[PDB]
Amino acid sequence: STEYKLVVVGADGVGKSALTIQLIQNHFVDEYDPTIEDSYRKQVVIDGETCLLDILDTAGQEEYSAMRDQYMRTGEGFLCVFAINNTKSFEDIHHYREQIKRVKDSEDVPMVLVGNKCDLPSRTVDTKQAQDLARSYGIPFIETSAKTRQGVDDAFYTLVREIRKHKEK
């Protein structure tokens, strides 16, 4: 096996917890405490390699957290998640990205832009607007639904692929 430290960031309510639980336990949760931040370990084979993905599902935290601090030091890749029916969560994306660059002290940090809740019909964030933003950053964009599981494995697999390519350079 090979270890990858991933972090899932994005506005409250975008579906970070639902995406992680769907990946880990293969189930969709309608409700998961928005204040809980925790780490998960997904065991899956990617491109032949057995990978152990330690994933930090983030939540708002004021007081110091040793687990959050460990991911601030060792986190290799980030899923920046917004919800396609929430323009405000899309507006936050550039701030999450700029902050990540400062955390890693690097202009090149493995990252994937995720547009979640793609099962919903009342779309307010255009796919073109998200694809343009992802193109401007030089990163992949993946539309997901934690509800149907659409794109969930792609989002995490692609991030692992990005970390592998960054490590090659």
Partner: peptide, 11 residues
């Protein structure tokens, strides 16, 4: 205190 927010209180 690393901004922008982004993640709140990231120091």
């Amino acid at each position: 205190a690393i901004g922008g927010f982004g993640f709140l209180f990231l120091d």
